[PDB]
Design a protein around this ligand. Structure first.
Ligand SMILES: [Ca+2]
Ligand SMILES: [Ca+2]
Ligand SMILES: [Ca+2]
Ligand SMILES: [Ca+2]
Ligand code: NI
Ligand code: NI
Ligand code: NI
Ligand code: NI
Lengths: 237, 237, 237, 237
């Protein structure tokens, strides 16, 4: 199966798979059953921003999510990602809907990864920044229902022509280039990711959420991973 | 055929295809017969650095090459690259040898591309930086004789186990992700590239050179493009 | 006197000092009488963005200004800034009003300068980015009527408590650190600046404009440089 | 007195002020008596590199030091720097000698600080990179015996014309602009610093070391802070 590390922005509480009884941000290490969560005061129809950070010295995966005019939510988990993920990965965004639904619109996405070796200084890096997405966005691998270019955004899940979100949808976008997160000469490896999103629903109970994830390079959407599985996991184990 | 824009570091003068009678730096727009050249005081066995810059406002492709302790060489050419290249490209390094030969060793390579739209501000970017190359460098597409990982470098052309360059060799390395160099909302597009290289030969007359190039995404080494064609062109037209 | 290079966003046509008969963007080299202008379809009350670029290989100062949903305006001028400016400079934003007036509100400002030497690679750089300005913004030198922190913005000229712009106002903001734009070992020097602005006026005829400028490090607002002189020049010569 | 946070590269063991009995890297929070140390296999006459990282989510100050061909040393300490340092700081490098001595030569220094607010995204940043230092390096505040420009380097402590280090020397270099490390709207604040150094001594017992430090903006060298006090502290408390 794939290997997944993710930060979930989980809009729907599924208490039988360990969700708390409220929308939450969570750190997912090879399971949808988050290793750590924090309450997230999700705002339907507002643009929010998520930040994810990690480095190999501290071995702590941390995330922060906020909206304008509001306090932030944060979660952290101690994990050595070199013991979870392969040396080469892809990075992506995933989202889903089920019988409950929402738009999962990405307005911007940036990522920076650095590997500093013991040669003088000496730095290896990848950075990308999307503030618009066009119809044929050749540096993204789109999976499932994901599309680019409508209002210049990345729509991870299906939206009707009128703009209404659809249920039973899953989609992902992965950056085209593989990312090197460990190398034998590295003395420090780090990454940072940011994305801005708009989750809107006509309903009092939106579902299911958006995640930033890191995977094996050949990761694909698991069968049946609509809804609570966030397009990331094949089951709720 | 492919579409190629390149900056050549041309170590061998082929006067019947328009080279000046000395090693030179040149700007190549769809032909090995450079549109502009400048004299280049190439130093066998020393590490040099090349810089390439362009933006869509000025429409001027410029390059500078230098060694430590030495003066630089520079060349510029007025060209609207949106009239030459497709909207999506790959970027790469190429080198060749013929009956005359040299090592074509790359010690570092960086690239930055930016597309600024009329949305507030708003910036799209790709950056990469290699200061080492490992054996399985999954974010490079290696073509021909190119290899990575020997002494942590990118060897574009074949080198024997003892370190001696071989003749009749061609190789290229392209960054894995496609690069977006034009978009309909962009108000300014720019790129910059830098690479450090070591060209060494046991011979008084090294050949053939190294180039930084921009191509159609599916570019491959043309048949017969050893030697004076730099792994870039199918003929000398 | 000071030495000034500037890109003006000139909102009021002063035809006796060479302005065209419309709002314009211009390149000013030691004089308010621009060396080059282009028509600028200024939009009262909308947030716009300006970009300024230069490098020492091409010796061309270029600027672009745009609004969302609108075409851009651009201007370029061939000038070797090493023949105009000292080796160390400060960079800043300036604005003014006269008997006609406008707000001169800066929402964001970024700047990057690079000096690449002939040592391997080897790069020297300064970058800053402001997306908010607080009350005590210690890394800006504020001159004249400029203030920071109201609605998190930089107000270059005076605004009343109700938000109404005042006449006969001038103000500037300079980044605190001096900037090195020439060095004897540099093989390429470059800079880029971006700022986002909001010019609003209750009047059909706003005045006077906003400029990005580069000066001697000890530059101060010249006496009498309200209005058409943009806080930059002591006279209209 | 000043407020100092530093990462020390401590070349001389002063066991009565808590140094371990070997050269070490240490985290110093308002005292020379490090809160955490790690063994450092210092190599006389070789160029090394140090990296320092911190963010306000994790509240962990970490450092790594290495040489080419050698293993690294690392140290970390949990500290909320917003409870130690003021909101505005300067950043610097310091070094000293006493009756034992060494050169304290800086070949390169980079720094990046970021403040991400809850406005969309939205980022504030400062970055600088020095890979050479010239005679009149106007963006550095030099204190004590520090000089710039000899062989294009920053010599923090006194070196004779022949290149021999002198005893009883102290010197510092601070970046000219103040740095904003906390702001009330920030959701994440981070910094990273890197420097490359050459510590050489004719002696079997070099002293005293080099530190990267963060201070109140008006920090000056304390009286009597040669030798074991690293130009940072007024006493050994
Ligand atoms: Ca859930
Ligand atoms: Ca040739
Ligand atoms: Ca005017
Ligand atoms: Ca000591
Ligand atoms: Ni959950
Ligand atoms: Ni040629
Ligand atoms: Ni004008
Ligand atoms: Ni110590």
């Amino acid at each position: 199966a794939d290997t997944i590390v993710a930060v979930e922005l989980d809009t729907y509480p599924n208490t039988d798979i360990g969700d708390p009884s409220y929308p939450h941000i969570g750190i997912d290490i090879k399971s949808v059953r988050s290793k750590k969560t924090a309450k997230w005061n999700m705002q339907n129809g507002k643009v929010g921003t998520a930040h994810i950070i990690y480095n190999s010295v501290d071995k702590r995966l941390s995330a922060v999510v906020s909206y304008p005019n509001a306090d932030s939510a944060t979660v952290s988990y101690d994990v050595d990602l070199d013991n979870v993920l392969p040396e080469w990965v892809r990075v992506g965004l995933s989202a889903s809907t089920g019988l409950y639904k929402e738009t999962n619109t990405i307005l911007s996405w940036s990522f920076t990864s650095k590997l500093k070796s013991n040669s003088t200084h000496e730095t290896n890096a990848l950075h990308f920044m999307f503030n618009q997405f066009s119809k044929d966005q050749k540096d993204l691998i789109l999976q499932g229902d994901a599309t680019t270019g409508t209002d210049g955004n990345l729509e991870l899940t299906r939206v009707s022509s009128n703009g209404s979100p659809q249920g039973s949808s899953v989609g992902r976008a992965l950056f085209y280039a593989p990312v090197h997160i460990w190398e034998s000469s590295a003395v420090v490896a780090s990454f940072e990711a940011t994305f801005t999103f708009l989750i809107k629903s006509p309903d009092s109970h939106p579902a299911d959420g958006i995640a930033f994830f890191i995977s094996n390079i050949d990761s694909s959407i698991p069968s049946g991973s609509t809804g609570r599985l966030l397009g990331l996991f094949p089951d709720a184990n």
